[PDB]
Enzyme design. Structure first.
Site, PDB file in Angstrom:
ATOM      1  N   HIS A 145       0.960  -1.342  -0.036  1.00 34.29           N
ATOM      2  CA  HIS A 145      -0.082  -0.079   0.077  1.00 34.29           C
ATOM      3  C   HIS A 145       0.931   1.480   0.038  1.00 34.29           C
ATOM      4  CE1 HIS A 145      -3.156  -2.710   1.028  1.00 34.29           C
ATOM      5  NE2 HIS A 145      -2.636  -3.226   1.889  1.00 34.29           N
ATOM      6  N   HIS A 177       5.898   6.767   6.572  1.00 34.56           N
ATOM      7  CA  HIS A 177       5.574   6.312   5.423  1.00 34.56           C
ATOM      8  C   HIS A 177       5.177   7.425   4.489  1.00 34.56           C
ATOM      9  CE1 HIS A 177       1.832   5.940   7.373  1.00 34.56           C
ATOM     10  NE2 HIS A 177       1.205   6.394   6.294  1.00 34.56           N
ATOM     11  N   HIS A 232       2.165   8.686   1.052  1.00 29.44           N
ATOM     12  CA  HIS A 232       1.198   8.683   0.201  1.00 29.44           C
ATOM     13  C   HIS A 232       1.544   9.768  -0.885  1.00 29.44           C
ATOM     14  CE1 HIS A 232      -1.448   6.865   3.317  1.00 29.44           C
ATOM     15  NE2 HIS A 232      -0.719   7.732   4.112  1.00 29.44           N
ATOM     16  N   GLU A 270      -3.263  13.381   1.345  1.00 27.13           N
ATOM     17  CA  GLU A 270      -4.597  12.994   2.145  1.00 27.13           C
ATOM     18  C   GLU A 270      -5.325  14.270   2.515  1.00 27.13           C
ATOM     19  OE1 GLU A 270      -3.414   9.238   4.129  1.00 27.13           O
ATOM     20  OE2 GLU A 270      -4.430   8.394   2.481  1.00 27.13           O
ATOM     21  N   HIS A 283       3.676  10.629   6.788  1.00 25.05           N
ATOM     22  CA  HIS A 283       3.017  10.533   8.013  1.00 25.05           C
ATOM     23  C   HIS A 283       3.973   9.785   8.897  1.00 25.05           C
ATOM     24  CE1 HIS A 283      -1.083  10.387   5.936  1.00 25.05           C
ATOM     25  NE2 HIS A 283      -0.772  11.555   6.425  1.00 25.05           N
ATOM     26  N   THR A 338      -5.812   6.334   8.193  1.00 25.63           N
ATOM     27  CA  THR A 338      -6.282   6.657   6.897  1.00 25.63           C
ATOM     28  C   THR A 338      -6.352   5.353   5.931  1.00 25.63           C
ATOM     29  OG1 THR A 338      -4.260   7.273   6.041  1.00 25.63           O
ATOM     30  CG2 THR A 338      -5.671   9.168   6.863  1.00 25.63           C
TER      31      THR A 338
HETATM   32 ZN   LIG Z   1      -0.566   7.487   6.331  1.00 30.80          ZN
END
Ligand SMILES: [Zn+2]
Ligand SMILES: CN1C(=O)NS(=O)(=O)c2ccccc21
Ligand SMILES: CN1C(=O)NS(=O)(=O)c2ccccc21
Length: 257
Positions: free
Chosen positions: A61, A91, A93, A103, A116, A195
């Site tokens: 992911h 990590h 996004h 996000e 994050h 999230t």
């Molecule tokens: Zn995250």
């Protein structure tokens, strides 16, 4: 089963995780004119000097860097938080294009990516117990925009070719996450959730106002990762972001005027 595709993406998650339609879901749009300065927010304390990174891994992911959290070494305190929160992992996004990937949004603006840094409240003893509590986690969110390179990110980007596919990991010791922080610690804060599934409503979100700049070459390397495992059809790991969720009965507070 869940992911970011048409048939398993964020609009489907509520079927397995009904809290997806809950009262304190993340991310959210930060409306800067409606967020109120809160003079009672105490000083924010990011103490990363003793951080001990361990591994970097592709979990299908995102990719994450893990830390030793068996002792108070890299901790987040202050700001809206009561007590001590240990850094467990960070990590990102990111998007398929520079105009999307974050996000959280700021007045509906999407950044190219979002970092994050995930911490858990030591009063609960372990992260699994913390995720069952409304104040169990604190996530420091940092926006990435594309411009100049971030030197403190290059060590991450240079190892990504070794964790291309889901399930791959590598040693990633001696990484200093202070090199990922912007100058200012001005922030917005609100109560929210993870999230990704299980979408647990356990997070105090702390989103920094100042983005970091990364280069186009750095983010292009994120986009060459794969959602799939080795020896499967290649699906590029891009657009691994959940869109903004309804704010509902919450107020976003600003640490700054
Ligand atoms: Zn995250
Ligand atoms: N998914 C992760 O990817 N990394 S984690 O922060 O250890 C974690 C903790 C608790 C629940 C789900 C989690
Ligand atoms: N999955 C995310 O994607 N971003 S996050 O909300 O920081 C997070 C925190 C803890 C466990 C899983 C998480």
């Amino acid at each position: 089963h869940w992911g970011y595709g048409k048939h398993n993406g964020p609009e489907h998650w509520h079927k397995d995780f009904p809290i997806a339609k809950g009262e304190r879901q993340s991310p959210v749009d930060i409306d800067t004119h409606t967020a109120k300065y809160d003079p009672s927010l105490k000083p924010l304390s990011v103490s990363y000097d003793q951080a001990t990174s361990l591994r970097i891994l592709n979990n299908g992911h995102s990719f994450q860097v893990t830390f030793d959290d068996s002792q108070d070494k890299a901790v987040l305190k202050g700001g809206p938080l009561d007590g001590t929160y240990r850094l467990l992992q960070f990590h990102f996004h990111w998007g398929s294009l520079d105009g999307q990937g974050s996000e959280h949004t700021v007045d509906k603006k999407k950044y190219a990516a979002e970092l994050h840094l995930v911490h858990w409240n030591t009063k609960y003893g372990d992260v699994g117990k913390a995720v069952q509590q409304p104040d169990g986690l604190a996530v420091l969110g940092i926006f990435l925009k594309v411009g100049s390179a971030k030197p403190g990110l290059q060590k991450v980007v240079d190892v990504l070719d070794s964790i291309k596919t889901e399930g791959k990991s590598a040693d990633f010791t001696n990484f200093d996450p202070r090199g990922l922080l912007p100058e200012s610690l001005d922030y917005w804060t609100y109560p929210g959730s993870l999230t990704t599934p299980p979408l647990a409503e356990c997070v105090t979100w702390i989103v920094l106002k100042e983005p970091i700049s990364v280069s186009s070459e750095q983010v292009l390397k994120f986009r060459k990762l794969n959602f799939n495992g080795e020896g499967e059809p290649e699906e590029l790991m891009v657009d691994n972001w959940r869109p903004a969720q309804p704010l509902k009965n919450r107020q976003i507070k600003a640490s700054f005027k």
